[PDB]
Amino acid sequence: SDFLLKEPTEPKFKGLRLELAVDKMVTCIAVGLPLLLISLAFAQEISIGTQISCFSPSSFSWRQAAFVDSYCWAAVQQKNSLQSGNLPLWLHKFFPYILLLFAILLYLPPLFWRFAAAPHICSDLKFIMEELDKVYNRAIKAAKSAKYPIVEQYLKTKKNSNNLIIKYISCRLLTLIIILLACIYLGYYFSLSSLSDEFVCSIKSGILRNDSTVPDQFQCKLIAVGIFQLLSVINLVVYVLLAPVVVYTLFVPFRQKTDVLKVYEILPTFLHFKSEGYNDLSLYNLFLEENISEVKSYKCLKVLENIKS
Amino acid sequence: SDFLLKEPTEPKFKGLRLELAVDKMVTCIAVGLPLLLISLAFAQEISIGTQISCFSPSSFSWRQAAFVDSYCWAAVQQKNSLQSGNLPLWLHKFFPYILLLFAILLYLPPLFWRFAAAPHICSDLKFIMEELDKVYNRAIKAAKSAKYPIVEQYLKTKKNSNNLIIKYISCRLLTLIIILLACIYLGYYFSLSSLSDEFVCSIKSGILRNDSTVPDQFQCKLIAVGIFQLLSVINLVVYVLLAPVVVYTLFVPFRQKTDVLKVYEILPTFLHFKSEGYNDLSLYNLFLEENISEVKSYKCLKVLENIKS
């Protein structure tokens, strides 16, 4: 019955989404934004010039007063002369550092996927979809003349295996873990009162312990905390919106519409290949329906299930 | 018995992982992070402007006080006027330098592998996998009609040789050695007390030895030690987590699932080719199972061992 449904199989599989659309969307948002927020912070933390400012006495010089700002900038680490809450202080100093920490931490599971599992996905999808075309092509030619094909047996092989889905879930689980850790850190950082960005520093160490010309206390002010709290809540808001998305990517079997192989039951050369117990077949169903565009036989089957009327 | 298992051998081997997924993952983490930490340090060590600040008397000028900061910055090298612990001081001055030292030291074994062993891996994998397809293709055609093939003899040749695995292990051993040396350095640098970033400098040399207007002692402060200790522990944490990974890459025979050639026993034209005594065959088994995607015959054998039921 081949009158207008013949496939030359001339165009190969050039563009294959080796990672799902949601995973690419999450990775771009989860990694891009902290990179963009730091680029935002670094751009305007150098526009203002300084990151800490301490009110030195008028008797100080421009290098005596710069020392106070420089000494007290490093004195944030030392939890003996600042005061109250000392943990909120060195988080203010290290917020752009930590913002990059989970910026690149959230990039590793995508990087690991592109190294250890993406090439395996590429070939298996290429094999499954090429053999799907061959099955459909031979199916119509069998009808043109008028058991357990290669595709079906290969899918059962993936159902009994779970090595690749473990890589996928662990990459998604690590992304969830790092996002949740980032949510805790960004949530705690935004929880810090904006009045806690000023600390009463004191330069009394070494020969300056008994020095009388040096005031006992200096009123410092981390002036970049204001922008950081804006960036923390901005990054927290997306991460508490990305977290429900990421946990949805963990449920590999459940995120299927069961419309990937249901259309192949029409062929006479053919199948409950939907999902079962978080197997590698369940993961391949995600990548088959995501990369269901480049397979030319699938579109021919869509009409066939819609031509029975 | 060739009904749906024929291979045209049209697509060549375009993307071959000439280095293992773990090696790429380790190299990116082991080299990328110190590069990123320095980029982090350099970005914010110029945002604060200065790296050392000394409290000069109010009678000094802006170039007399800049001299004190400049002289005492270089005086860290001279272990005669700083004081206590002098080794921790010039490590503070040279920490970003040394951080790059093993950043590029950890890059050389990957660079050496890409120069001296990667092309050899590329051809041998191309030869083994192309001949594997030919063996499988002739195997089914022999069954379609109804001793020691090229692949098996070539593998035995690699079993008697170890020149390439010596290159691999030495590259991994050098990476382990440099990481362990970095762990010792970063571990020791973080072991330095944060109160040791301030040293009582003294400008008494040359004509200034008898000068009375110059104070005998200057209270200096390396203000970049606070961020460095954060970067040291951050880099130490990953390196003490990379070290168990790197030592695992050394055990070439043991890091195999024995699922690379076990599926080729089905063919009638065929084999204990798993590993033995750290030979070049053991290394090729790693690269065969890592680059087991691009070989089209392997996926056909996976069903064959799963079609016997």
Coordinates of C-alpha atoms in Angstrom, one line a residue:
Chain A
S1 CA 0.0 0.0 0.0
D2 CA 3.0 2.3 -0.7
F3 CA 1.6 5.1 -2.8
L4 CA 2.8 8.2 -1.0
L5 CA 4.6 6.9 2.1
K6 CA 8.1 6.0 0.8
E7 CA 11.3 7.0 2.6
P8 CA 14.6 7.3 0.8
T9 CA 16.5 7.6 4.1
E10 CA 18.8 10.3 2.7
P11 CA 19.0 12.7 5.6
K12 CA 20.9 11.4 8.6
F13 CA 20.5 12.4 12.3
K14 CA 22.4 15.7 12.4
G15 CA 20.9 17.5 15.4
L16 CA 20.1 15.2 18.3
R17 CA 19.2 16.6 21.7
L18 CA 21.6 14.5 23.8
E19 CA 20.0 16.2 26.9
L20 CA 16.4 17.0 27.4
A21 CA 14.8 20.4 26.8
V22 CA 14.1 20.8 30.5
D23 CA 17.7 19.9 31.4
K24 CA 19.1 22.4 29.0
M25 CA 16.6 25.0 30.3
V26 CA 17.4 24.3 33.9
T27 CA 21.2 24.2 33.3
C28 CA 21.1 27.6 31.5
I29 CA 19.1 29.2 34.3
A30 CA 20.8 27.4 37.2
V31 CA 24.3 28.2 35.9
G32 CA 23.8 31.3 33.8
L33 CA 22.1 33.5 36.4
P34 CA 24.8 33.2 39.1
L35 CA 27.3 33.9 36.4
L36 CA 25.2 36.9 35.3
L37 CA 24.6 38.1 38.8
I38 CA 28.4 38.1 39.5
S39 CA 28.9 39.9 36.3
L40 CA 26.3 42.4 37.6
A41 CA 27.9 42.6 41.0
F42 CA 31.5 42.8 39.7
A43 CA 30.5 45.5 37.2
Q44 CA 29.0 47.8 39.9
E45 CA 31.2 46.9 42.8
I46 CA 34.1 48.4 40.8
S47 CA 32.0 51.3 39.7
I48 CA 31.7 52.3 43.3
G49 CA 35.4 51.4 43.6
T50 CA 35.6 50.1 47.2
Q51 CA 33.9 47.2 48.9
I52 CA 34.5 48.2 52.5
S53 CA 34.7 51.7 54.0
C54 CA 35.7 52.6 57.6
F55 CA 35.4 56.0 59.1
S56 CA 38.9 56.9 60.2
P57 CA 39.7 60.0 62.3
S58 CA 40.6 63.2 60.5
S59 CA 44.2 63.0 61.9
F60 CA 44.8 59.9 59.7
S61 CA 46.5 60.1 56.3
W62 CA 45.3 58.6 53.0
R63 CA 47.4 55.5 53.6
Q64 CA 46.6 55.3 57.3
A65 CA 42.9 55.4 56.5
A66 CA 43.4 53.0 53.5
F67 CA 45.1 50.7 56.0
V68 CA 42.0 50.8 58.2
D69 CA 39.8 49.8 55.3
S70 CA 42.3 47.2 54.2
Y71 CA 43.0 45.8 57.6
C72 CA 39.4 45.6 58.6
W73 CA 38.5 44.0 55.2
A74 CA 40.8 41.2 56.2
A75 CA 39.8 41.4 59.9
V76 CA 36.4 40.1 58.9
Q77 CA 37.9 36.6 58.9
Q78 CA 39.3 37.1 62.4
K79 CA 36.5 36.5 64.9
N80 CA 38.2 38.2 67.9
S81 CA 37.9 42.0 67.3
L82 CA 34.9 42.6 65.1
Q83 CA 32.5 42.7 68.1
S84 CA 27.5 39.9 67.8
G85 CA 27.0 38.0 64.6
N86 CA 30.4 37.2 63.0
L87 CA 29.2 34.5 60.6
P88 CA 27.1 37.1 58.6
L89 CA 30.2 39.3 58.1
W90 CA 32.6 37.0 56.2
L91 CA 29.6 35.8 54.1
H92 CA 29.3 39.4 52.9
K93 CA 33.0 39.3 52.0
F94 CA 32.8 35.9 50.2
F95 CA 29.3 36.1 48.6
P96 CA 30.5 36.5 45.0
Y97 CA 33.0 33.7 45.6
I98 CA 30.3 31.3 46.9
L99 CA 27.9 32.5 44.2
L100 CA 30.4 31.2 41.6
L101 CA 30.9 28.0 43.7
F102 CA 27.5 26.6 42.9
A103 CA 27.5 28.3 39.6
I104 CA 30.2 25.9 38.5
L105 CA 29.0 23.1 40.8
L106 CA 25.7 23.2 38.9
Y107 CA 27.6 23.0 35.7
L108 CA 29.5 19.8 36.5
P109 CA 26.5 17.4 36.2
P110 CA 25.7 18.8 32.8
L111 CA 29.5 18.6 32.0
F112 CA 29.6 15.0 33.3
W113 CA 26.5 14.1 31.2
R114 CA 28.2 15.5 28.1
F115 CA 31.3 13.4 28.8
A116 CA 30.1 10.1 30.3
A117 CA 26.5 9.5 29.0
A118 CA 25.8 11.9 26.1
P119 CA 27.8 9.9 23.5
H120 CA 26.1 6.7 24.7
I121 CA 22.7 8.4 24.2
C122 CA 23.7 9.6 20.8
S123 CA 24.5 6.2 19.4
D124 CA 21.6 4.4 21.0
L125 CA 19.2 7.0 19.8
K126 CA 20.8 6.8 16.4
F127 CA 20.5 3.0 16.4
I128 CA 16.9 2.9 17.7
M129 CA 15.7 5.6 15.3
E130 CA 17.5 4.2 12.3
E131 CA 16.2 0.7 13.0
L132 CA 12.7 2.3 13.5
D133 CA 12.9 3.7 10.0
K134 CA 14.0 0.3 8.7
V135 CA 11.2 -1.5 10.5
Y136 CA 8.6 1.0 9.1
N137 CA 10.2 0.9 5.6
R138 CA 10.1 -2.9 5.5
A139 CA 6.6 -2.8 7.0
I140 CA 5.0 -1.0 4.1
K141 CA 7.0 -3.0 1.6
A142 CA 5.6 -6.1 3.2
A143 CA 2.1 -4.6 2.6
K144 CA 3.3 -3.5 -0.9
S145 CA 3.8 -7.1 -2.0
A146 CA 0.2 -8.0 -0.9
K147 CA 8.6 -11.8 15.2
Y148 CA 10.3 -9.7 17.9
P149 CA 12.0 -7.2 15.6
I150 CA 15.5 -5.6 16.2
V151 CA 14.0 -2.5 17.8
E152 CA 11.8 -4.3 20.2
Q153 CA 14.5 -6.7 21.4
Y154 CA 17.0 -3.8 21.8
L155 CA 14.5 -1.9 23.9
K156 CA 14.0 -4.9 26.2
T157 CA 17.8 -4.9 26.7
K158 CA 17.7 -1.4 28.0
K159 CA 14.7 -2.3 30.2
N160 CA 16.9 -4.8 32.1
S161 CA 19.7 -2.3 32.5
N162 CA 19.9 0.9 34.6
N163 CA 23.5 2.1 34.3
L164 CA 22.6 5.1 32.1
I165 CA 19.6 6.2 34.1
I166 CA 21.7 6.1 37.2
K167 CA 24.0 8.6 35.5
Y168 CA 21.0 10.8 34.5
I169 CA 19.3 10.7 37.9
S170 CA 22.5 11.3 39.8
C171 CA 23.3 14.3 37.6
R172 CA 19.8 15.5 38.3
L173 CA 20.1 14.6 42.0
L174 CA 23.4 16.5 42.3
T175 CA 21.8 19.5 40.6
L176 CA 18.9 19.3 43.1
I177 CA 21.4 18.9 46.0
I178 CA 23.5 21.9 44.9
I179 CA 20.4 24.0 44.2
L180 CA 18.9 23.1 47.6
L181 CA 22.3 23.9 49.2
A182 CA 22.3 27.2 47.3
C183 CA 18.7 27.9 48.4
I184 CA 19.8 27.4 52.0
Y185 CA 22.9 29.6 51.6
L186 CA 21.0 32.3 49.6
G187 CA 18.1 32.0 51.9
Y188 CA 20.3 32.4 54.9
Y189 CA 22.3 35.3 53.3
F190 CA 19.1 37.2 52.5
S191 CA 18.0 36.5 56.1
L192 CA 20.9 38.6 57.3
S193 CA 19.7 42.1 58.4
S194 CA 20.9 44.9 56.2
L195 CA 22.0 46.7 59.4
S196 CA 24.5 43.9 59.9
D197 CA 26.8 45.1 57.1
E198 CA 28.5 47.5 59.4
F199 CA 30.9 46.2 62.1
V200 CA 32.9 48.0 64.7
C201 CA 36.5 47.0 63.7
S202 CA 39.5 47.5 65.8
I203 CA 43.2 47.8 64.7
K204 CA 44.9 46.5 67.9
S205 CA 47.6 43.9 67.0
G206 CA 51.3 43.8 67.2
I207 CA 53.0 47.1 67.8
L208 CA 49.6 48.9 67.5
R209 CA 48.3 47.3 70.6
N210 CA 49.6 50.0 72.9
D211 CA 49.6 52.8 70.2
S212 CA 47.7 55.8 71.4
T213 CA 47.2 57.7 68.1
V214 CA 45.2 54.8 66.7
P215 CA 41.5 54.9 67.8
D216 CA 40.4 51.9 69.7
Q217 CA 37.4 51.3 67.4
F218 CA 36.7 52.0 63.7
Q219 CA 33.1 52.1 62.3
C220 CA 33.3 50.1 59.1
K221 CA 30.7 49.4 56.5
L222 CA 30.6 46.6 53.9
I223 CA 28.9 48.7 51.1
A224 CA 28.4 45.8 48.7
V225 CA 25.9 44.0 51.0
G226 CA 23.1 46.0 49.6
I227 CA 23.5 44.8 46.1
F228 CA 24.3 41.3 47.3
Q229 CA 21.0 40.9 49.2
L230 CA 19.3 42.0 46.0
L231 CA 21.2 39.3 44.1
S232 CA 20.6 36.7 46.8
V233 CA 16.9 37.1 46.7
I234 CA 16.9 37.2 42.9
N235 CA 18.9 34.0 42.7
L236 CA 16.9 32.5 45.6
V237 CA 13.6 33.2 43.8
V238 CA 14.6 31.3 40.6
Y239 CA 16.3 28.5 42.6
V240 CA 13.1 27.9 44.7
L241 CA 11.3 27.9 41.3
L242 CA 14.0 25.6 39.7
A243 CA 13.8 23.1 42.6
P244 CA 10.2 22.0 41.8
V245 CA 11.4 21.7 38.2
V246 CA 14.5 19.7 39.0
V247 CA 12.6 17.2 41.3
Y248 CA 10.2 16.7 38.4
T249 CA 13.1 15.7 36.2
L250 CA 14.0 13.0 38.8
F251 CA 10.7 11.2 38.2
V252 CA 11.8 9.8 34.8
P253 CA 9.0 7.3 34.3
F254 CA 6.2 9.7 35.3
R255 CA 7.2 12.5 32.9
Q256 CA 5.9 10.7 29.8
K257 CA 2.7 11.2 27.7
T258 CA 2.9 7.6 26.3
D259 CA 2.8 8.9 22.8
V260 CA 6.3 7.8 21.5
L261 CA 5.7 4.1 20.6
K262 CA 1.9 4.0 20.8
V263 CA 1.8 5.0 17.1
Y264 CA 4.0 2.0 16.0
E265 CA 1.4 -0.6 16.9
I266 CA -0.1 0.1 13.5
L267 CA 2.7 -1.7 11.6
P268 CA 2.2 -5.5 11.1
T269 CA 5.8 -6.3 11.9
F270 CA 5.7 -5.2 15.5
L271 CA 4.2 -3.6 23.0
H272 CA 3.9 -2.1 26.5
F273 CA 7.2 -0.1 26.3
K274 CA 6.1 2.9 28.4
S275 CA 8.1 2.7 31.7
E276 CA 8.8 0.4 34.6
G277 CA 10.7 0.9 37.8
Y278 CA 13.2 3.6 36.7
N279 CA 15.0 1.5 34.0
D280 CA 17.2 2.7 31.2
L281 CA 14.2 2.1 28.9
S282 CA 12.3 4.7 30.8
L283 CA 15.1 7.2 30.2
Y284 CA 15.3 6.3 26.5
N285 CA 11.5 6.9 26.2
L286 CA 12.2 10.5 27.3
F287 CA 14.9 10.9 24.7
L288 CA 12.9 9.1 22.0
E289 CA 9.9 11.5 22.4
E290 CA 12.2 14.5 22.7
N291 CA 14.1 13.4 19.6
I292 CA 11.0 12.2 17.9
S293 CA 11.3 15.0 15.2
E294 CA 14.3 13.7 13.2
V295 CA 12.8 10.2 12.8
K296 CA 10.8 10.4 9.6
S297 CA 8.8 7.2 10.1
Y298 CA 7.1 8.6 13.2
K299 CA 5.4 11.3 11.3
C300 CA 4.2 8.7 8.8
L301 CA 2.7 6.7 11.6
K302 CA 0.9 9.7 13.1
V303 CA -1.3 9.9 9.9
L304 CA -1.7 6.2 9.9
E305 CA -3.3 6.2 13.3
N306 CA -5.4 9.1 12.1
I307 CA -6.2 7.5 8.8
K308 CA -8.1 4.6 10.2
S309 CA -11.4 6.6 10.1
Chain B
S1 CA 20.1 -15.4 9.4
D2 CA 20.4 -11.8 8.2
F3 CA 16.9 -10.4 8.2
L4 CA 17.2 -7.2 10.1
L5 CA 20.9 -7.1 11.3
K6 CA 22.8 -5.8 8.2
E7 CA 25.3 -3.0 8.5
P8 CA 26.2 -0.8 5.5
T9 CA 29.3 0.6 7.3
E10 CA 28.6 4.2 6.0
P11 CA 29.2 6.3 9.1
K12 CA 32.9 6.4 10.1
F13 CA 34.3 7.1 13.6
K14 CA 33.9 10.9 13.9
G15 CA 33.9 11.4 17.7
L16 CA 36.3 9.2 19.6
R17 CA 37.0 9.8 23.3
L18 CA 40.8 9.6 23.1
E19 CA 40.9 10.1 26.8
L20 CA 38.5 8.5 29.3
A21 CA 35.5 10.3 30.8
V22 CA 37.0 10.3 34.3
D23 CA 40.3 11.7 32.9
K24 CA 38.5 14.5 31.2
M25 CA 36.4 15.1 34.3
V26 CA 39.4 15.1 36.6
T27 CA 41.5 17.3 34.3
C28 CA 38.7 19.9 34.0
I29 CA 38.3 20.0 37.8
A30 CA 42.0 19.7 38.7
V31 CA 43.1 22.4 36.2
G32 CA 39.9 24.5 35.8
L33 CA 39.4 25.3 39.5
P34 CA 42.8 26.7 40.3
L35 CA 42.4 28.8 37.1
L36 CA 39.0 29.9 38.3
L37 CA 40.1 30.5 41.8
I38 CA 42.9 32.7 40.6
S39 CA 40.4 34.5 38.4
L40 CA 38.3 34.9 41.5
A41 CA 41.3 36.1 43.5
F42 CA 42.7 38.4 40.8
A43 CA 39.2 40.0 40.3
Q44 CA 38.7 41.0 43.9
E45 CA 42.4 41.6 44.9
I46 CA 42.3 44.5 42.4
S47 CA 38.8 45.5 43.5
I48 CA 40.3 46.2 47.0
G49 CA 43.3 47.7 45.1
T50 CA 46.2 46.9 47.4
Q51 CA 47.5 43.5 48.5
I52 CA 49.6 44.8 51.5
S53 CA 48.9 47.7 53.8
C54 CA 51.2 49.1 56.5
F55 CA 50.3 51.7 59.2
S56 CA 52.7 54.5 58.6
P57 CA 52.9 57.5 60.9
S58 CA 50.8 60.6 60.2
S59 CA 54.0 62.6 59.5
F60 CA 54.6 60.5 56.3
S61 CA 53.6 61.6 52.9
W62 CA 51.6 59.6 50.3
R63 CA 54.8 58.5 48.7
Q64 CA 56.6 57.9 52.0
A65 CA 53.7 55.7 53.1
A66 CA 53.4 54.0 49.7
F67 CA 57.1 53.2 50.0
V68 CA 56.5 51.5 53.3
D69 CA 53.8 49.3 51.8
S70 CA 56.0 48.8 48.7
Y71 CA 59.2 48.1 50.6
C72 CA 57.6 45.8 53.1
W73 CA 55.8 44.0 50.3
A74 CA 59.3 43.1 48.9
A75 CA 60.7 42.7 52.4
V76 CA 58.6 39.6 52.9
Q77 CA 61.3 37.7 50.9
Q78 CA 64.1 39.0 53.2
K79 CA 64.0 36.9 56.4
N80 CA 66.0 39.3 58.5
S81 CA 63.7 42.2 59.6
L82 CA 60.1 40.8 59.5
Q83 CA 60.4 39.5 63.1
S84 CA 58.4 34.2 64.3
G85 CA 57.1 32.3 61.3
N86 CA 58.7 33.7 58.1
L87 CA 57.8 30.8 55.8
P88 CA 54.0 31.5 56.1
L89 CA 54.6 35.1 55.0
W90 CA 56.1 34.7 51.5
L91 CA 53.6 32.0 50.8
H92 CA 50.9 34.6 51.3
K93 CA 52.7 36.8 48.7
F94 CA 53.2 33.9 46.2
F95 CA 49.9 31.9 46.7
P96 CA 48.3 32.9 43.4
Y97 CA 51.6 32.2 41.7
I98 CA 51.8 28.7 43.2
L99 CA 48.1 28.1 42.6
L100 CA 48.8 28.5 38.9
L101 CA 52.0 26.4 39.1
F102 CA 50.1 23.1 39.7
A103 CA 47.2 24.5 37.6
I104 CA 49.5 24.2 34.6
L105 CA 51.4 21.3 36.1
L106 CA 48.2 19.3 36.2
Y107 CA 47.6 20.3 32.6
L108 CA 50.8 18.8 31.2
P109 CA 50.0 15.1 31.6
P110 CA 46.7 15.7 29.7
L111 CA 48.7 17.7 27.2
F112 CA 51.3 15.0 26.9
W113 CA 48.6 12.4 26.4
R114 CA 47.1 14.4 23.6
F115 CA 50.5 14.7 22.0
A116 CA 52.2 11.3 22.5
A117 CA 49.5 8.7 23.1
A118 CA 46.2 10.1 21.9
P119 CA 46.9 9.7 18.1
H120 CA 48.0 6.1 18.8
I121 CA 44.8 5.5 20.7
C122 CA 42.8 7.0 17.8
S123 CA 44.1 4.7 15.1
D124 CA 44.2 1.5 17.2
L125 CA 40.6 2.0 18.3
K126 CA 39.7 2.8 14.7
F127 CA 41.4 -0.4 13.6
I128 CA 39.9 -2.6 16.4
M129 CA 36.4 -1.2 16.0
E130 CA 36.4 -1.3 12.2
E131 CA 37.7 -4.8 12.2
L132 CA 35.1 -5.7 14.8
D133 CA 32.4 -4.5 12.4
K134 CA 34.0 -6.6 9.6
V135 CA 34.2 -9.7 11.9
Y136 CA 30.5 -9.3 12.8
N137 CA 29.5 -8.5 9.3
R138 CA 31.2 -11.6 7.9
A139 CA 29.8 -13.6 10.8
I140 CA 26.2 -13.1 9.9
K141 CA 26.9 -13.6 6.2
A142 CA 28.5 -16.9 7.1
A143 CA 25.2 -17.8 8.8
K144 CA 23.4 -16.2 5.9
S145 CA 24.8 -18.8 3.5
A146 CA 23.6 -21.7 5.7
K147 CA 40.4 -19.4 13.3
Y148 CA 42.1 -16.6 15.4
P149 CA 40.6 -13.6 13.5
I150 CA 42.3 -10.3 12.8
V151 CA 40.8 -8.6 15.9
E152 CA 41.8 -11.4 18.4
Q153 CA 45.4 -11.6 17.1
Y154 CA 45.8 -7.8 17.2
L155 CA 44.5 -7.7 20.8
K156 CA 47.1 -10.4 21.8
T157 CA 49.7 -8.1 20.3
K158 CA 48.7 -5.3 22.7
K159 CA 48.6 -7.8 25.6
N160 CA 52.3 -8.5 25.2
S161 CA 53.1 -4.8 25.0
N162 CA 52.9 -2.1 27.7
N163 CA 54.4 1.0 26.2
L164 CA 51.1 2.9 25.9
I165 CA 49.8 1.9 29.3
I166 CA 53.1 3.2 30.8
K167 CA 52.3 6.6 29.2
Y168 CA 48.7 6.4 30.6
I169 CA 49.7 5.5 34.1
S170 CA 52.6 7.9 34.3
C171 CA 50.3 10.7 33.1
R172 CA 47.8 9.6 35.9
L173 CA 50.7 9.1 38.3
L174 CA 52.1 12.6 37.6
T175 CA 48.6 14.0 38.1
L176 CA 48.3 12.1 41.4
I177 CA 51.8 13.4 42.4
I178 CA 51.0 17.0 41.6
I179 CA 47.6 16.8 43.3
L180 CA 49.2 15.3 46.4
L181 CA 51.9 18.0 46.3
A182 CA 49.1 20.6 45.9
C183 CA 47.2 19.0 48.8
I184 CA 50.3 19.3 51.0
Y185 CA 50.8 22.9 49.9
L186 CA 47.2 23.9 50.1
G187 CA 46.8 22.0 53.4
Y188 CA 49.8 23.7 54.8
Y189 CA 48.7 27.1 53.6
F190 CA 45.3 26.7 55.2
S191 CA 47.1 25.5 58.3
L192 CA 48.6 29.1 58.6
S193 CA 46.8 31.1 61.3
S194 CA 44.8 34.0 59.9
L195 CA 46.5 36.2 62.6
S196 CA 49.9 35.5 60.8
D197 CA 49.0 37.7 57.9
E198 CA 50.3 40.8 59.7
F199 CA 54.0 41.2 60.2
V200 CA 56.0 43.9 62.0
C201 CA 58.1 45.2 59.1
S202 CA 61.1 47.5 59.5
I203 CA 62.6 49.9 57.0
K204 CA 66.2 50.0 58.2
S205 CA 68.6 49.5 55.3
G206 CA 71.2 51.7 53.5
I207 CA 70.9 55.3 54.4
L208 CA 67.8 54.8 56.4
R209 CA 69.6 52.7 59.0
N210 CA 70.5 55.7 61.1
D211 CA 67.5 57.9 60.0
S212 CA 65.5 59.1 62.9
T213 CA 62.3 60.3 61.2
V214 CA 61.6 56.8 60.0
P215 CA 59.9 54.7 62.7
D216 CA 61.8 51.6 63.7
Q217 CA 58.8 49.2 63.1
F218 CA 55.8 49.3 60.8
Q219 CA 52.7 47.2 61.4
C220 CA 51.9 45.7 58.0
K221 CA 49.0 43.5 57.0
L222 CA 48.7 41.2 54.0
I223 CA 45.0 41.8 53.3
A224 CA 44.6 39.1 50.6
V225 CA 45.3 36.2 53.0
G226 CA 41.7 36.1 54.0
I227 CA 40.5 35.3 50.5
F228 CA 43.5 33.0 49.9
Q229 CA 42.7 30.8 52.9
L230 CA 39.1 30.5 51.5
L231 CA 40.5 29.5 48.1
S232 CA 43.1 27.2 49.7
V233 CA 40.4 25.1 51.5
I234 CA 38.1 25.2 48.5
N235 CA 40.9 23.9 46.3
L236 CA 42.1 21.5 49.0
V237 CA 38.6 20.0 49.4
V238 CA 38.3 19.1 45.8
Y239 CA 41.9 17.9 45.6
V240 CA 41.4 15.5 48.5
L241 CA 38.3 14.4 46.7
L242 CA 40.1 14.2 43.4
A243 CA 42.9 12.2 44.9
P244 CA 40.7 9.1 45.6
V245 CA 39.4 9.4 42.0
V246 CA 42.9 9.7 40.5
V247 CA 44.3 6.7 42.4
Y248 CA 41.3 4.8 41.0
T249 CA 42.3 5.7 37.5
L250 CA 45.7 4.1 38.2
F251 CA 44.2 0.7 38.7
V252 CA 43.6 0.1 34.9
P253 CA 42.7 -3.6 35.0
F254 CA 40.3 -3.3 38.0
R255 CA 38.1 -0.5 36.6
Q256 CA 36.3 -2.8 34.1
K257 CA 32.9 -4.3 34.1
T258 CA 34.0 -7.1 31.7
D259 CA 31.1 -6.2 29.4
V260 CA 33.1 -5.1 26.3
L261 CA 34.0 -8.3 24.6
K262 CA 31.8 -10.8 26.5
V263 CA 29.0 -10.0 23.9
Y264 CA 31.2 -11.1 21.0
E265 CA 31.4 -14.7 22.0
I266 CA 28.0 -15.2 20.3
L267 CA 29.5 -15.0 16.8
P268 CA 30.8 -18.3 15.3
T269 CA 34.0 -16.7 13.9
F270 CA 35.5 -15.8 17.2
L271 CA 38.3 -15.3 24.5
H272 CA 39.4 -14.2 28.0
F273 CA 40.4 -10.7 26.9
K274 CA 39.5 -8.9 30.1
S275 CA 42.8 -7.8 31.7
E276 CA 46.2 -9.2 32.9
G277 CA 49.1 -7.6 34.8
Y278 CA 48.7 -3.9 33.6
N279 CA 49.2 -4.5 29.9
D280 CA 48.3 -2.3 26.9
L281 CA 45.3 -4.6 26.3
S282 CA 44.0 -3.7 29.7
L283 CA 44.1 0.0 28.8
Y284 CA 42.5 -0.7 25.4
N285 CA 39.6 -2.4 27.2
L286 CA 39.0 0.8 29.0
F287 CA 38.9 2.7 25.7
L288 CA 36.9 0.0 23.9
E289 CA 34.1 0.1 26.5
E290 CA 34.3 3.9 26.7
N291 CA 34.2 4.2 22.9
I292 CA 31.7 1.3 22.6
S293 CA 29.0 3.6 21.3
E294 CA 30.3 4.3 17.8
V295 CA 30.8 0.6 17.0
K296 CA 27.5 -0.4 15.4
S297 CA 28.2 -4.2 15.7
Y298 CA 28.3 -4.0 19.5
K299 CA 24.6 -2.9 19.8
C300 CA 23.7 -5.8 17.4
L301 CA 25.5 -8.2 19.7
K302 CA 23.7 -6.9 22.8
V303 CA 20.3 -8.1 21.4
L304 CA 21.9 -11.4 20.3
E305 CA 22.9 -12.2 23.8
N306 CA 19.4 -11.1 24.9
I307 CA 17.7 -13.0 22.1
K308 CA 18.8 -16.5 23.1
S309 CA 15.7 -16.8 25.3

